[PDB]
Enzyme design. Structure first.
Site, PDB file in Angstrom:
ATOM      1  N   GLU A 126      -5.320 -15.147 -16.607  1.00  0.00           N
ATOM      2  CA  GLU A 126      -4.755 -13.824 -16.623  1.00  0.00           C
ATOM      3  C   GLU A 126      -4.353 -13.382 -15.195  1.00  0.00           C
ATOM      4  O   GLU A 126      -3.256 -12.852 -15.000  1.00  0.00           O
ATOM      5  CB  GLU A 126      -5.689 -12.899 -17.334  1.00  0.00           C
ATOM      6  CG  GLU A 126      -5.692 -13.301 -18.879  1.00  0.00           C
ATOM      7  CD  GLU A 126      -4.416 -12.818 -19.589  1.00  0.00           C
ATOM      8  OE1 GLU A 126      -3.914 -11.712 -19.191  1.00  0.00           O
ATOM      9  OE2 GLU A 126      -4.014 -13.533 -20.593  1.00  0.00           O
ATOM     10  N   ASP A 174      -0.551 -12.616 -13.907  1.00  0.00           N
ATOM     11  CA  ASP A 174      -0.180 -11.383 -13.220  1.00  0.00           C
ATOM     12  C   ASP A 174       0.525 -11.683 -11.902  1.00  0.00           C
ATOM     13  O   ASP A 174       1.567 -11.150 -11.558  1.00  0.00           O
ATOM     14  CB  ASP A 174      -1.427 -10.539 -12.970  1.00  0.00           C
ATOM     15  CG  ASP A 174      -2.252 -10.148 -14.153  1.00  0.00           C
ATOM     16  OD1 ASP A 174      -1.752 -10.366 -15.333  1.00  0.00           O
ATOM     17  OD2 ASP A 174      -3.366  -9.653 -13.980  1.00  0.00           O
ATOM     18  N   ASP A 220      -2.249  -5.523 -26.790  1.00  0.00           N
ATOM     19  CA  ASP A 220      -1.807  -6.748 -27.492  1.00  0.00           C
ATOM     20  C   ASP A 220      -2.140  -6.688 -28.977  1.00  0.00           C
ATOM     21  O   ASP A 220      -2.037  -7.731 -29.665  1.00  0.00           O
ATOM     22  CB  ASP A 220      -2.417  -7.969 -26.836  1.00  0.00           C
ATOM     23  CG  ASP A 220      -1.874  -8.285 -25.461  1.00  0.00           C
ATOM     24  OD1 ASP A 220      -0.936  -7.652 -24.983  1.00  0.00           O
ATOM     25  OD2 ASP A 220      -2.471  -9.241 -24.865  1.00  0.00           O
ATOM     26  N   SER A 266       0.241  -8.113 -20.858  1.00  0.00           N
ATOM     27  CA  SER A 266      -0.222  -8.587 -19.555  1.00  0.00           C
ATOM     28  C   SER A 266       0.872  -9.296 -18.764  1.00  0.00           C
ATOM     29  O   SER A 266       0.658  -9.448 -17.538  1.00  0.00           O
ATOM     30  CB  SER A 266      -1.392  -9.524 -19.710  1.00  0.00           C
ATOM     31  OG  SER A 266      -2.479  -8.781 -20.276  1.00  0.00           O
TER      32      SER A 266
END
Ligand SMILES: [Ca+2]
Ligand SMILES: [Cl-]
Length: 369
Positions: free
Chosen positions: A79, A83, A169, A286
């Site tokens: 993650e 990003d 999500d 995300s």
């Protein structure tokens, strides 16, 4: 109508019409993380090196107790990779500095995350801060987290910082055990529901064979094998009042409506990201938030970092100037015939849609922001 495929992050400027803008080389960007980023920094080096880009200046910041747990969360590295690589790609390959504000993992409650937000605001060095995370706003409200964190975001907005927060999500089913279909019962995520942040929802991105933008629909990939929905978060807060700039969206409750804008989020149209050395195709809101962050950081660099918190300006500019966005019109963010539908103009799945960056830059040159 284009093709659904994965995309290198370095393609997002072409897709969203940002190639003619400066890079974010003059703007510092922050990323809120849960725990450490040691593998993420290696994956970032793989990213810049593979793409032939100059290396990115990074710093990591322990935001809570000096005795806290800042070890790497292994699944979390992917993650933070999503990003960081998506920010740098969308920024045109350069940012002044990338600051990782690491939340303590051994703190009580949600205080590790709260302290990470607080440090980014107190330091007031990053102009734009990415938050590719969240949870049911009602749970955040029930323990006092919402109130404590909203104070921090309010300070950010007053200081001219932009927090960008993924809308979720789980489609409309955020609070139903994080995305299980729940009929007509709709909910939203925190901190996206704060009126002091830019909430970023998700699209399914289609491109032409030459790689140009073709179209976007709502992100909704249906249920996984556990029965959980994967779709863009969108709706309204049950707690937060409507900020006045949202009044331009008539016929909505007196609540903070979200998302504000949206970018690519479908896994099937997602980003190719280096994660523990291996390229994976990753989506989510995300992804959409870091796309916004990198693009917005370019506009900040173009404007000497003088653009304040942009929510009011987005709503006035886009409502009066539809050419500034790609208006998403097709799809829904529920399941089984439930959820909100996209439509003309602002809608609950996608907000105003995605930004056309060169057109927005020309608007800002003429009109300010
Ligand atoms: Ca729309
Ligand atoms: Cl407000």
């Amino acid at each position: 109508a284009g093709t659904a495929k994965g995309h290198n992050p370095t393609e997002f400027p072409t897709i969203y019409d940002a190639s003619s803008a400066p890079t974010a080389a003059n703007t510092t960007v922050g990323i809120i993380t849960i725990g450490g980023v040691s593998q993420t920094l290696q994956d970032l080096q793989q990213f810049t090196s593979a793409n032939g880009l100059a290396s990115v200046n990074t710093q990591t910041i322990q935001t809570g107790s000096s005795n806290g747990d800042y070890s790497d969360d292994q699944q979390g590295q992917g993650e933070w990779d999503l990003d960081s690589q998506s920010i740098v790609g969308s920024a045109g390959g350069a940012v002044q500095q990338l600051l990782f504000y690491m939340a303590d993992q051994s703190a009580s409650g949600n205080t590790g995350l709260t302290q990470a937000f607080n440090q980014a605001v107190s330091d007031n060095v990053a102009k734009v801060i990415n938050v590719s995370l969240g949870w049911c706003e009602a749970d955040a409200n029930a323990d006092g987290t919402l109130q404590a964190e909203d104070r921090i975001f309010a300070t950010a907005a007053a200081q001219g910082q932009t927090f960008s927060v993924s809308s979720g999500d789980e489609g409309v089913y955020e609070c139903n055990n994080r995305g299980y279909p729940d009929g007509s019962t709709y909910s939203v995520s925190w901190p996206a529901s704060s009126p002091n942040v830019i909430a970023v929802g998700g699209t399914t991105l289609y491109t032409t064979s030459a790689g140009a933008y073709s179209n976007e629909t709502v992100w909704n990939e249906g249920l996984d094998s556990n029965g959980k929905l994967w779709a863009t978060g969108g709706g309204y807060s049950v707690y937060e009042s409507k900020p006045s700039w949202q009044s331009v969206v008539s016929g909505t409750p007196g609540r903070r409506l979200l998302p504000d804008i949206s970018f690519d989020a479908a896994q099937g149209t997602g980003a190719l990201i280096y994660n523990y050395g291996q390229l994976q195709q990753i989506g989510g809101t995300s992804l959409a938030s870091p796309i916004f962050v990198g693009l917005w950081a370019r506009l900040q660099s173009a404007n000497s970092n003088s653009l304040g918190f942009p929510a009011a300006s987005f709503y006035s500019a886009i409502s009066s100037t539809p050419s500034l966005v790609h208006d998403v019109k097709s799809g829904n963010n529920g399941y089984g015939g439930y959820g909100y539908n996209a439509g003309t103009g602002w809608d609950y799945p996608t907000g105003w849609g995605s930004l056309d960056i060169a057109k927005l830059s020309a608007y800002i040159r003429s009109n300010g922001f």
